[PDB]
């Protein structure tokens, strides 16, 4: 199944933050309405934040997270969780290799902000 794609409410500001846990340098692309809105890159095996940014989900609300290591797409896992019918997390894990820890880049999208 498709992973890393989330329908946010339209025109809504959201946070996107990525963490790295791999020897491979991670590239995290965040697309809004199918166009690149942010790109984070970095290398850590200690959960370093490789990027954090506030974006607007725009007219469609469609947000897609892509993760690659030197252009090779990682395998993605994702889900959305809503707490008290108000607080939204869109969660991505990714696997660039064989050990299936799925933490190689970890991406958290949260909304609403403010």
């Amino acid at each position: 199944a498709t992973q890393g794609v989330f329908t946010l409410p339209a025109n809504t500001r959201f946070g996107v933050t990525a963490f790295a846990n791999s020897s491979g340098t991670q590239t995290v692309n965040v697309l809004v309405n199918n166009e690149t809105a942010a790109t984070f890159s970095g290398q850590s095996t200690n959960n370093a934040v490789i990027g954090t940014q506030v974006l607007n989900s725009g007219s469609s609300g469609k947000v897609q997270v892509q993760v690659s290591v030197n252009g090779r797409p990682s395998d993605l896992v994702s889900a959305q969780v809503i707490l008290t019918n108000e607080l939204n997390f869109a969660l991505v894990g990714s696997e660039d290799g064989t050990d299936n820890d799925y933490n190689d880049a970890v991406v958290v999208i949260n909304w609403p902000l403010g």
Binding site: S22, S23, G24, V69, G97, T98, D99
Partner: peptide, 11 residues
Amino acid sequence: XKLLKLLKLLX
């Protein structure tokens, strides 16, 4: 990356 290659010349 780094890890698997080192487990590769091994087991």
